[PDB]
Amino acid sequence: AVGKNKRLSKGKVVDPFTRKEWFDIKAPSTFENRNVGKTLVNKSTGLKSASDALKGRVVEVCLADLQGSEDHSFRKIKLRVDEVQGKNLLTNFHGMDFTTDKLRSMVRKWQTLIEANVTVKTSDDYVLRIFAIAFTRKQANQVKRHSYAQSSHIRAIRKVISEILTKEVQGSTLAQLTSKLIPEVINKEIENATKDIFPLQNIHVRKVKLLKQPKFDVGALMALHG
Amino acid sequence: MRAKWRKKRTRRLKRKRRKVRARSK
Amino acid sequence: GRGAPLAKVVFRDPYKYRLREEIFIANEGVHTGQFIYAGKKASLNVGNVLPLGSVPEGTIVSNVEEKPGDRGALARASGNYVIIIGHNPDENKTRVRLPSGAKKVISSDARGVIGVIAGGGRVDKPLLKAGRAFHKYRLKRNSWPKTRGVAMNPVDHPHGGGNHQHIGKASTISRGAVSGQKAGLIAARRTGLLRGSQKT
Amino acid sequence: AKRTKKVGITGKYGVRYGSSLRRQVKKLEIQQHARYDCSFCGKKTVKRGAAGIWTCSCCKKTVAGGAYTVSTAAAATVRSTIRRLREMVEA
Amino acid sequence: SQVFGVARIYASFNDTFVHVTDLSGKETIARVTGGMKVKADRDESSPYAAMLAAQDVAAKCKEVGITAVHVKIRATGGTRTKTPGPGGQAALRALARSGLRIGRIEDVTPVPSDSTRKKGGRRGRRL
Amino acid sequence: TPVTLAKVIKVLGRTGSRGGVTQVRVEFLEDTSRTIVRNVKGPVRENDILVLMESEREARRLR
Amino acid sequence: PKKRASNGRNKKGRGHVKPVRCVNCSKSIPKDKAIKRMAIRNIVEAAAVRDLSEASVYPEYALPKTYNKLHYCVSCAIHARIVRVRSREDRKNR
RNA sequence: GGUGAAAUUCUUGGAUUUAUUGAAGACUAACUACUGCGAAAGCAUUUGCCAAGGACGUUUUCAUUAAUCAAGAACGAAAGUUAGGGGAUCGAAGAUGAUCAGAUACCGUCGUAGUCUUAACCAUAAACUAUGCCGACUAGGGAUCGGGUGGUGUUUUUUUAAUGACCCACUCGGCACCUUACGAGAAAUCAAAGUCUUUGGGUUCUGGGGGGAGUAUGGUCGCAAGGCUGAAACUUAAAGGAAUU
């Protein structure tokens, strides 16, 4: 194990944290009190610099940490850093998804795993692929312990969910979109419009992906941090 | 011996016999 | 002498009252009476001549040139095309894939026609005869038939000589060899039949 | 009256040039000498004039295509792909 | 205060990795694997080696000043064992009461969706 | 060598192929209320104090 | 002879079933023929939650679980004691 | 990196590792069950088009147009063959390192054909439900899929119509399951393997002790490997099936 290396160098010192420095992150204002944390980036040399290194960075943070609450424990978001003015590197919204434990305990036998996804874009040239998931419900006084649904019912539910999802996505920007994901308001009218077809249960929004991005947009990026 | 390997040996013998007959005729 | 058909396009001279007739390699899918738009502002249609800096990523082009003003250099044989893999704005250069598989950066001012050259899949029918090969090579050059160096006399060829038809020395020839010694394989990095995919 | 069993058009070659080459040239010659139709009229009068040139006696339109076929699978794929990029660019 | 760094613990049946990185993940605080702690060439994935590696990582993090750590466990991952290694639990337990305070326990093992083929043939292992 | 004197309260049973190793659940008087599972070679009864060299060395059933 | 009413597994009127690979021996077996165990465990072992609670940032919280579905073949299950052989009469239960 | 232990091999020109992006190719986990479709082989992502099929209702139509099949024809797992694209993983041959008296294998690392897709051959398997198709009858019980009918039923809506999703009762067509044996069977077991010594519903195919042998030959199809039909000479008194100690 330890004594196994025969030779190391094919051709044939100081602690890096002295040069390493600390930089605080600032999440967009669409969330609550930020208190993101702190990252380590190498010294701002004349060739690489700290700012350009911070440009290509993403920080994974749970939504419960941002909100200062509990019911958002099983939701987490990546924050994409875009610019830094010094010790307060600002970031934006990248994507939201649940935990592996949440997904695995969500998926259970004797149920259904209706799913939907549509490739859409927002007003500000922001293309996002919105994912939606749905499970059939066992109604009260039911003795049939499988809650199976017909393929036509699945098709209709998926079509309705996609229609409402596109209606929500169209005519909105990232700030309002995130401010409406946060309180979990999509599932309300999703289940309202899909409850007639099937009772439905465990309605959540799976994940979003950031595919295409417009220009830097400093003027409105500064709005998310003051 | 296994029937599969016996059959394979039979195919090999059949190929050899066919080659011998072809070279004779 | 060329498998690819030649398309004749007439263009009005914008500085004098006359008709200037170009010589174009007939792309696959073109037909008589179809208008051909050549220029940067022209749309993306088969046969149109556009600069390489205007076509989107993944475009298939033909009759491209190494430098602007070369009147079309690369991808001029029947059934070949060039695939635009990327664009680089600063010091504008379009990264492309050639039919041979090599990737070369060329200036965005280079112009290539849209589509593939007609007559693709020319070499699938075997010549099947000496007559067809002779007629094909007669229209090209005096490069047929060719006599083997083993049957060649020893003075006529380094490989020749001896009672039996054998090379004698190594067939591979170094790049540093002088004229007269370059008889056989030249700079053989890997000799013999390759096993598996070429992975080009 | 089915004068031949399988050789077909290559019956002119007789006992020559092997069998696999004869079959390949038979298939390629069938594809070459088959008549097609002009996309501008819809009448099966398209014939082959030269290497890659498909002429007609009625539509009077010459089309540049494959050596032995009016349209090639690779050519059609390239045309569809180019149309796809054009639509993506303008939309 | 209580600056947060992630642990990125890798548990396998042959070796254990405790590679503490920043919250973003582009850092190298005490990568230290569980291979140099024991000279056995067989006991690399063992609770003792895992605990020693966790203690070394905790000491290095205390030296660097990080006090709050998140833990992201992962198994071998892929077309293979899929189960967490015995060393992961021991490393987590050792790192818990040895300095840094942990939070947001989470598993991040990558599990494919019917991709490629499992090595071993159609007849499987025949030891 | 940092020692830890720990008194046992419950012998789990005899482990190992040859039965020379016995499992036990043991805690230490100093800063008590936390216990670990240890393995003893010799005969061990209840209310027996043993000197552990190790602290974070939770053991496992022997073979 | 006819050792079992169901020849391999619950496959009547279906025929071909897409196969899956065993978790350990990586042997290809029909999906219904794989002994599937719904193993729901905890990513913190026994007698460790107490030590992991007070040594964790934020009060309570955490308490997650791991959930994996293991497809054990017949030989692997017999070797690992996942399923044990029994008498002829006990086979008909469940 | 790997295994019971090792070893080949990649490693201060960053090996493993962390984070981002891009390309490729394979597949459709978890949902996934004694559940669905199809003549069979066989089919699990979303959407659009083309049609096709089963079940149910029907006071609609023809009128016996019906059941099985020599010959013949269509489809037909995987692997293999010919000519192209692709060729990400796995990976027969092969190259090494282990173990062993020997290991050309089981074990570790690479690795061609192949694995994927297009146009054509291959016509095979434990292709099993080792159970032919059609039609009539025969102990019960529960659950489930599709369809149909009745609920002074529940819920969802717009507390209340429709539309759905549930619960109660009935029925047809299926996948099937459980206790028993009026019976069958040599038994294992079977609601069909029953209505066969109280022997007969119609009908097609296959077999007469085990080897030789699914071999030789004669034909036929196929580029090829091979596919269909298919013996005789000679030898033996046991070859076999189910259960019991």
Curated annotation (Swiss-Prot), chain A:
N-terminally acetylated by acetyltransferase NatA. Transmembrane segments: none annotated. Signal peptide: none annotated. Keywords: Acetylation, Cytoplasm, Isopeptide bond, Phosphoprotein, Ribonucleoprotein, Ribosomal protein, Ubl conjugation. Residues 1-13 are annotated as: Disordered. The modification N-acetylalanine is found at residue 1. Present with 92400 molecules/cell in log phase SD medium. This is Small ribosomal subunit protein eS1A.
Curated annotation (Swiss-Prot), chain B:
Keywords: Cytoplasm, Ribonucleoprotein, Ribosomal protein. Residues 1-25 are annotated as: Disordered. The keyword Protein transport does not apply. One of its GO terms (molecular function) is structural constituent of ribosome. The lineage of its organism: Eukaryota, Fungi, Dikarya, Ascomycota, Saccharomycotina. Component of the ribosome, a large ribonucleoprotein complex responsible for the synthesis of proteins in the cell. The small ribosomal subunit (SSU) binds messenger RNAs (mRNAs) and translates the encoded message by selecting cognate aminoacyl-transfer RNA (tRNA) molecules. The large subunit (LSU) contains the ribosomal catalytic site termed the peptidyl transferase center (PTC), which catalyzes the formation of peptide bonds, thereby polymerizing the amino acids delivered by tRNAs into a polypeptide chain. Present with 11900 molecules/cell in log phase SD medium. Belongs to the eukaryotic ribosomal protein eS32 family. GO terms for biological process: cytoplasmic translation. Component of the small ribosomal subunit (SSU). Mature yeast ribosomes consist of a small (40S) and a large (60S) subunit. The 40S small subunit contains 1 molecule of ribosomal RNA (18S rRNA) and 33 different proteins (encoded by 57 genes). The large 60S subunit contains 3 rRNA molecules (25S, 5.8S and 5S rRNA) and 46 different proteins (encoded by 81 genes). One of its GO terms (cellular component) is cytosolic large ribosomal subunit. It is found in: Cytoplasm. The keyword Cytoplasm applies. This is Small ribosomal subunit protein eS32A.
Swiss-Prot record, chain D:
Transmembrane segments: none annotated. The modification Phosphoserine is found at residue 39. A zinc finger (C4-type) spans 38-59. One of its GO terms (molecular function) is structural constituent of ribosome. GO terms for cellular component: cytosol; cytosolic large ribosomal subunit. It is found in: Cytoplasm. It comes from the Eukaryota. GO terms for biological process: cytoplasmic translation. InterPro entries: Ribosomal_eL37/eL43, Ribosomal_eL43, Ribosomal_protein_eL43, Ribosomal_zn-bd. Keywords: Cytoplasm, Metal-binding, Phosphoprotein, Ribonucleoprotein, Ribosomal protein, Zinc, Zinc-finger. Gene3D superfamilies: 2.20.25.30. Present with 44600 molecules/cell in log phase SD medium. NCBIfam families: eL43_euk_arch (TIGR00280), PRK03976.1 (NF003058). Component of the large ribosomal subunit (LSU). Mature yeast ribosomes consist of a small (40S) and a large (60S) subunit. The 40S small subunit contains 1 molecule of ribosomal RNA (18S rRNA) and 33 different proteins (encoded by 57 genes). The large 60S subunit contains 3 rRNA molecules (25S, 5.8S and 5S rRNA) and 46 different proteins (encoded by 81 genes). HAMAP family: Ribosomal_eL43. Belongs to the eukaryotic ribosomal protein eL43 family. This is Large ribosomal subunit protein eL43A. It comes from Saccharomyces cerevisiae (strain ATCC 204508 / S288c). The lineage of its organism: Eukaryota, Fungi, Dikarya, Ascomycota, Saccharomycotina.
From Swiss-Prot, chain F:
GO terms for biological process: maturation of SSU-rRNA; positive regulation of nuclear-transcribed mRNA catabolic process, deadenylation-dependent decay; ribosomal small subunit assembly; ribosomal subunit export from nucleus; translation. Its main location: cytoplasm. It comes from the Eukaryota. One of its GO terms (cellular component) is cytosol. It is found in: Cytoplasm. Keywords: Acetylation, Cytoplasm, Ribonucleoprotein, Ribosomal protein. Present with 94500 molecules/cell in log phase SD medium. There are 2 genes for eS28 in yeast. Component of the small ribosomal subunit (SSU). Mature yeast ribosomes consist of a small (40S) and a large (60S) subunit. The 40S small subunit contains 1 molecule of ribosomal RNA (18S rRNA) and 33 different proteins (encoded by 57 genes). The large 60S subunit contains 3 rRNA molecules (25S, 5.8S and 5S rRNA) and 46 different proteins (encoded by 81 genes). This is Small ribosomal subunit protein eS28A. It comes from Saccharomyces cerevisiae (strain ATCC 204508 / S288c) (Baker's yeast).
